[PDB]
Amino acid sequence: RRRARGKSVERGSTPLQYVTTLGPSRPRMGQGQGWQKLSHEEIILQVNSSTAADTIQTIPIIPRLSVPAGDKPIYSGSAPHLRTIGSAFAIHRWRALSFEWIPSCPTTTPGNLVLRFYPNYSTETPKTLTDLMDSESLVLVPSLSGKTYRPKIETRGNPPELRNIDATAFSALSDEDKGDYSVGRLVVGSSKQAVVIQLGLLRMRYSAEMRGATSIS
Amino acid sequence: QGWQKLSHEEIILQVNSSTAADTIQTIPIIPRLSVPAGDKPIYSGSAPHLRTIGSAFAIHRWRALSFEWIPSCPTTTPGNLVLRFYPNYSTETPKTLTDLMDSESLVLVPSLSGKTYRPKIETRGNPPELRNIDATAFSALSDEDKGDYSVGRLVVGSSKQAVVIQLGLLRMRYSAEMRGATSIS
Amino acid sequence: MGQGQGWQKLSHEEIILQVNSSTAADTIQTIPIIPRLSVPAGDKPIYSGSAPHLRTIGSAFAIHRWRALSFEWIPSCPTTTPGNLVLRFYPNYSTETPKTLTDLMDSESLVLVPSLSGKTYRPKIETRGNPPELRNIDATAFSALSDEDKGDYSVGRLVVGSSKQAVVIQLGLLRMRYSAEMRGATSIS
Amino acid sequence: QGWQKLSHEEIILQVNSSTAADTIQTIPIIPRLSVPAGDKPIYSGSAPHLRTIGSAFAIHRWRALSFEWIPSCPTTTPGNLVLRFYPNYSTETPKTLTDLMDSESLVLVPSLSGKTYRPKIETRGNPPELRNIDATAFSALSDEDKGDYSVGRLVVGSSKQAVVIQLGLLRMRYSAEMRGATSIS
Amino acid sequence: RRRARGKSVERGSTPLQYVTTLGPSRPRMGQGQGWQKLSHEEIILQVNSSTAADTIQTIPIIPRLSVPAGDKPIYSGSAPHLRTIGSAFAIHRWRALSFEWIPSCPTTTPGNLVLRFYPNYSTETPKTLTDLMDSESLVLVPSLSGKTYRPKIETRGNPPELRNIDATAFSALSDEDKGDYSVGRLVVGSSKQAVVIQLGLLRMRYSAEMRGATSIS
Amino acid sequence: RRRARGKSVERGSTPLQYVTTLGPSRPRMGQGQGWQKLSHEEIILQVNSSTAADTIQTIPIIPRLSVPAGDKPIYSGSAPHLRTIGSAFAIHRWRALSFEWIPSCPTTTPGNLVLRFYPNYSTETPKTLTDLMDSESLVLVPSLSGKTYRPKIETRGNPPELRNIDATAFSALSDEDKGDYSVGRLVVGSSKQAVVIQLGLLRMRYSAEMRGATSIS
RNA sequence: UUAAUAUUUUUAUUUUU
RNA sequence: UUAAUAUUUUUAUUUUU
Ligand SMILES: [Ca+2]
Ligand SMILES: [Ca+2]
Ligand SMILES: [Ca+2]
Known part of the structure; x- marks a missing residue:
């Protein structure tokens, strides 16, 4: 690349599939300003x-992310390691x-995948794929890789301290009360397909800080 | 970080x-200020413009x-008008003009023009983010939970008159910041 | 002196x-570039596209200024989707829109394949210092105006051409990254 | 470039x-301000001096x-007087004193002296040049076309009184620049 | 010329005719700050x-200056080159x-020729040669050469962008709407003569800037 | 790459689609040896x-390339900018x-696309895809990109000056008379498909020279 | 860190290295 | 760029090199 103009008409190819391969990664622990730090990224x-x-x-953005131990559950998402670690602290704050959307399908599969973060749990959760993607949302074709969505959160200075709780119990909380335990939720909308297919995986890249020791769940 | 700023003044x-x-x-201090769609509601006041915009966002914070008290009565009007802000909703609401006006309150003669009351609120650095909701749904929740939705309330007390009359108007000069788009389909 | 009438800035993106x-x-x-974007109330209309959020806020003001x-084009179709999609902005409301996909792909247009994600198009618009103030209006009422008058209400229009497919399909979405300034409160009660 | 400057104040x-x-x-804000020579005028207000001069030019712009509100009533007069500027003529005109006074508006007790309202207009650099016409002909054109002839209109709302009385006068302090001589044969 | 005074009483001659000869000129094209520039001067x-x-x-001051395809149109003036060029753009602005009045008659011919520019099309167009010349106007004897009239227009900084349109269609516009398409109009008043005669030509010297590509008329 | 031999057996991949993206280009105007120069490339x-x-x-190779105002017209192709410019000159010559064939379909689509230039309009126009491609022609698979076809034309020294005319009127000329107005025509043959599909676009890269001012169409 | 725009009991927005 | 005059939520006017 240089500088002299032209008409700029970029040419390129396009695969049949965008491959990704997740090898063994090691979470990264660490002591902080009186806090416990953990940076990692799990599916x-x-x-x-x-x-x-x-x-x-x-998916509720909470440290102990797991699938509410009930029947006919109102939430999804399981973040094993993050949970285990966080189950030993009472307070957390995000850094x-x-x-990240990790596709697991051919460039042939049509439709779109939508990711959107909602700051307040008391917010009218959409039912339309079209209403969902209206704004503040990552939207792409299910086959595309390397795209990531970052929730608008205060991570500078000293964010507000939120309190850790257990998935199910959180699920049980009212809406005005979920606020104290979570930054917000990530709504994942995906269009239907001709037939049963796993469009892809949703990878959570993070860096939480936790404090206040706790016993057994 | 997504914030949208809006500074204005509405009655x-x-x-x-x-x-x-x-x-x-x-008057509950909420962005989506209107009077509750219930039968014989508790919260008074409405701000059409402000809410129309506040309806578009899920979170707010004040700057x-x-x-301001804008009279509509003559210099011959007696009594007083009282303005007082209450930070916590779990706080015992007055039922007397003399109890309401005890402290931290604007007190004047209904006919007096151009006075203003400024409530104590953090506007420095980055105040706590508050979730905004609709008038009705708000008045419908516990005082413990009201906090997360509003800075506080503005209690307006006013003397009774010889005969039914409009004392005046109450204007709100502000500047809020809101974020978190909502669906207005 | 002079009650709060100053501009209110709002920047955002919306499909x-x-x-x-x-x-x-x-x-x-x-698509007519108007704050209150929505489809015109009439049948067999001229303009497409709706911006719910933007519109709602736009409904509260009378004047807007683009900054x-x-x-951005967001595909929804498969990599095997033939033909191409085209984007071309027209600042003048009285310059007859082209009739052919071809000569719509001129020197100021962006042409790409339907499946290609990530491309964007930026129309040439004065946003320096203080552009012309435009008046807000409703979609329907707007599409009712005469071309000569449409100008005072909209910066321009974004034409969006697209090859025909073998069979009905959703090519993709079209996003708008903006930053408008509005003033002149209205009545929304 | 031909401009002629005139700064004055007229009621x-x-x-x-x-x-x-x-x-x-x-009141439409036009240099040639007078009341429509027609039966059933949409507008109000007249500025003899200003127009006499504005009749000499074809183009104007404001600086x-x-x-200013000048009362004529006693301290005993109730109600309020409302002043509000509307930038675009294609904007839904209020029909309620409470709707009119909602925002961006001067509101007071008819008897209150010396208050003033300043409309939002570009006076910096070189505002848009506006063509000036005659009251009548003006009120006679579409809202879309009204823009090219005027900055906006000043809506004046006022409470009804017990009995027919003159509330007060409304003064306009200005400074317009005009060019493009016309024939006054 | 020097400095020492005298009584200053200038003497001079005066022709029977002021000749002018317009040879082939080449218009001057040019790329600008995202604009297209054209400076030329045609009759x-x-x-x-x-x-x-x-x-x-x-004469309406417009880029595509030509006479209205109408039967007994109301606007005169044809600026061939300028029109052709500008018929490929949607926006214009004057620099x-x-x-300029180019006489084509003897110093014998009496009367006057009047040139005046009117900024707003909604301005009462005079019908009198006397009312026309009242002010803001070039007034001279039909025989005299080298005099030019410059319309009072903002040409500094960034003048307002006007929109290009076609002569006839423009002619069709209302008055409140002509403003968006033209700076103003040039009224050309000329006194009558003893008998049929072409007093002269009116030459337009200019520098327009245009942008926004357009197709076929 | 170097020099030492081997057996040379090149290996490679092959996309599902060959992408192309035409962004905003600016045509290039210019003054020449008394001529007007324009180099650009439009679809x-x-x-x-x-x-x-x-x-x-x-497609008839003419400056004012547009489709014939008519019913059941015979010449395709529209070159907007080139036409507008050229509609202001009477003579042209190619430099x-x-x-260039710009594909808009998957590597899946079969068949061929054929481009061939014919110097004399009085030449027996083929009706067979097979007869068309016999010789002097670019032939490729509809999916393939970056291939271009250059008409055999004298562009060195001082090519013959041809005369500009309007598409329809040209369409009207006899054959013996089309010669004076055009270098030749470009025959575009494309095999059929299983179902309705836009194989691709045909981009014209050029540098014409024009002279002799003209008025309105 | 810099440039632009909007508000003023305050910050928010866009761009550049 | 300079000199004069007029207005102040602003610029406009005339002259000189
Ligand atoms: Ca709570
Ligand atoms: Ca108009
Ligand atoms: Ca011949």
Whole structure:
């Protein structure tokens, strides 16, 4: 690349599939300003779409991310390591957080995948794939790789301290009360397909800080 | 980080006194200010413009907020008008003009022009983010939970008059910042 | 002196249009660049696209001024989708829109394949110092104005052409990264 | 480039209220301000001096423009007087004193002296050049086309009184620049 | 010339005719700050006066200056090159513009020729040669050469962008709407003569800037 | 690459689609040896193939390239900018001219696309895709990109000056008379497909020289 | 860190290295 | 760029090199 102009008409190819391969990674622990630090990135969600209709899921941004131990659950997402670690602290605050879309399908699969963060749990959760993607949302074709979505969160200075809680118990909280335990939720909308297929995985890249020791769950 | 800033001034309340007794109403300080769609609601006041915009966002925080008293009565009007801000909703609401006006309150003669009351609120650095909701749904929740949705309330007390009359208007000069787009389909 | 009447700045991004293709022929839609973007109330209309959020806020003001504007194409179709999509902005409301997909792809247009993600188009618009103040108006009422008068209400229009497919399909979405300034409160009660 | 500067102050309107209901009139901001020579005028207000001069030029632009309320009633007069500027003519005109006074508006008690309202207008650098016409012909054109002839309109709302009385006068302090001589044969 | 005074009483001759000869000129094209620049000077009007009465013409200052395809149109003036060029752009703005009177008659011919620019099309167009010349106007004897009239226009900084349109269609516009397409109009008033004669030509010297590509008329 | 031999057996991949992206280009104007110069490249043709049979189109190489105002017209191709410019001159001559095939379909689409230039309009225009491609023609698979076809034309020294005319009127000329107005025509043959599809666009890269001012069309 | 724009009991927005 | 005059939520006017 240089400088002299032209008409700029970029040419390129395009695969049949965008491959990704996640090898063994080691989480990164660390002591901080009186805090415990943990930076890592794990797969929190599998997006299998149905032929019946579009699918809209919701993941609560909480340290002990797991699937509410009930029946007919209102949430998705499991962040194993992050959970285990966080289950030993009472307070947390985010430093870095972003969700990366890892495609697991051919460039042939049509439709779109949508990611959107909602700051307040008392916010009218959309039911339309079209209403969901209206704004503040990552939108792409299910086959595309390397795209990531970063929730608008205060991570500078000293963010507000949120309190850790257990997935199910959180699930049980009212809406005006979920605020004290979570930054917000990540709604994952994916269009339907001709037939049963796992569009891809949703990878959570993060850096949480936790404090206040706790016993057994 | 997504913030949208909006600074303006709107008249949010009309204060007409009854002859039965003294009138003490309260305006909840919320972006989506309107009067609750219920039967005989608790919260008074409405700010059409502000809310129309506030309806577009899920979170807000204040940078500047003051209230001005605009009289509509003659110099011959007696009694007083009282303005007082209450930070916590879990705080025992007055039922007397003399109790309401005890402290931290603007007190004047209904006919007096151009006075203003400025509530105590953090506007420095980065205040706490508040979730905004709709008037109705708000008045519908516990005082413990009201905090996360509003800075506090503005209690407006006013003397009763000889006969039914409009004492004046109550203006709100502000500047909020909001973020978190909502669906207005 | 002089009550708060100053501008209110608002910058954001929003998806304002879904492009689906027909088998009849190539499709040439047009989006009017207005704060209160929504589809006109009439049947067999001229303009497409709706910006719910922007509009709602726009409904509260009477005057708008553009400071930042660009459009990004977001595919929804497969890599095997033939033909191409085209973007071309027209600042003058009285310059007859082209009739052919081809001569719509001129020197000031962006042309690409439907499946290609990530490209964007930035129209040439004065945003320096203090552009011309434009008046806010509703979609329907707008599409009712005469071209000569449409000018005072909109910066320009974004034409969006797209090859016809073998069979009905959703090509993609069209996003709008903007930054408008508005003033002149209205009545929304 | 031909400009002629003129800065002055003239009283352009007399506000007398009726007892039937609240009065809401509007003054278009045009150099050649006078009341439409027609039956059933949409507009109100007249500025003899200013127009006499404005009749000599074809183009104008503003540098300074404010409006002062001069009361004519006693301290015992109730109600309020409302002043509000509207930038675009294609904007839904209020029909309620409470809707009109919602925002961006001077509001006071009819008897209150010396207050003023300053509209939002570009006076910096070189504002847009506006063509000036005659009151009548003006009120006679579409809202879309009204823009090219005027900055905006000043809507004046006022409470109804017990009995027919002159509330006060409305003064306009300005400084316009005009060019393009016309024939005054 | 020097300095020492005297009484200053200038003497001079005076021809029977002031000759002018316009040879082939080449228009000057050029790329600008994202604009297209064109500076040239062409003859836009022929002034033939009648014996019946005084003549008052009007030329709309527009890029595509030509005469309205209408039967008994109201606008005169044709600027060929400028039109062709500008018919490929949607927006224009003036940098330099003036009208020069090129006489084509003897110093014998009496009367006057009047040039005046009117900024707003909604301005009461005079009908009198006397009312026309009242002010803001170039006034001279038809025989005299080298005089030019410059319309008072903002040409500094960044003048307002006007929109290009086609002569006829423009002619069709209302008055409140002509403003968006033209700076103003040039009214050309010329007194009558003893008998059929072409007083002279009206030469338009200019420098327009245009942008926004357009197709076929 | 070096020198030492081997057996040379080149290996490589192959996309699903060859992408192209035409951003905003600025045409290049310029003054010359008394001529007017213009170099640019615009899309002059859209090739949509039918399922009924093979398609054979013809584009006349002329400055004012546009489709014939008519019914059941015979010449395709529209070159907007080039036309507008050229509609202001009476004479033209080519310096550089080539046609580039810009594919808009998957490497899956079969068949061929054929480009061939014919110097004399009085030449028996083929009806067969097979006869068309016999010789002097660019032939490729619809999916392939970056291939261009250059018409065999004298562009050195001082080529013959041809005369500008308007598309329709040209369409009207006899054959023995078309010669004076055009270098030749470009026949575009494209095989049919399983179903309605736009194989691609045909981009015209050029450098014409024009002279002799003209008025309105 | 710098440039632009908007508000003023305050910060928010866009761009550049 | 300079000199004069007029207005002040602003610029406009005339002259000189
Ligand atoms: Ca709570
Ligand atoms: Ca108009
Ligand atoms: Ca011949």
